[PDB]
Amino acid sequence: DGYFKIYSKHTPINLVRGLPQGFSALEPLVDLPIGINITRFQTLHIS
Amino acid sequence: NYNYLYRLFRKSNLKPFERDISTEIYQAGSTPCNGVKGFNCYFPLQSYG
């Protein structure tokens, strides 16, 4: 509904390859009352 | 004044709570516009008298 909701969570982890087999919720971080019809996304590159 | 303008043609309706600023020709018939109005392609955007 014209709202971008971005929810973030940080966890100290030590497992190497797969996703940890544990459970933890996700608290909301930012609400974005802005309306766009985005259908694709890309991740920036780093050096 | 002709600064008050609106879109009359569109493919379908609109979802709630959004703004469309698509300034493109609309296909008003079986004739494909292909970037040229010609026939069966009227500009959906026009002003008011």
* Binary contact (B17, A37; C-beta < 8 A): no
List of chain B residues whose C-beta atoms are within 8 Å of the C-beta of residue A35: 17-19
Experimentally determined by = cryo-EM
Give B19→chain A minimum CA distance, Å.
8
Residues 6+ away with beta carbon under 8 Å from A21? none
B38 conformational bin, left if phi > 0, alpha if psi -120 to 50, beta if neither: left
* Binary contact (A35, B19; C-beta < 8 A): yes
Residues 6+ away with beta carbon under 8 Å from B8? B44, B45, B46
B35 conformational bin, left if phi > 0, alpha if psi -120 to 50, beta if neither: left
DSSP string, A23-45: -----EEEEE-------------
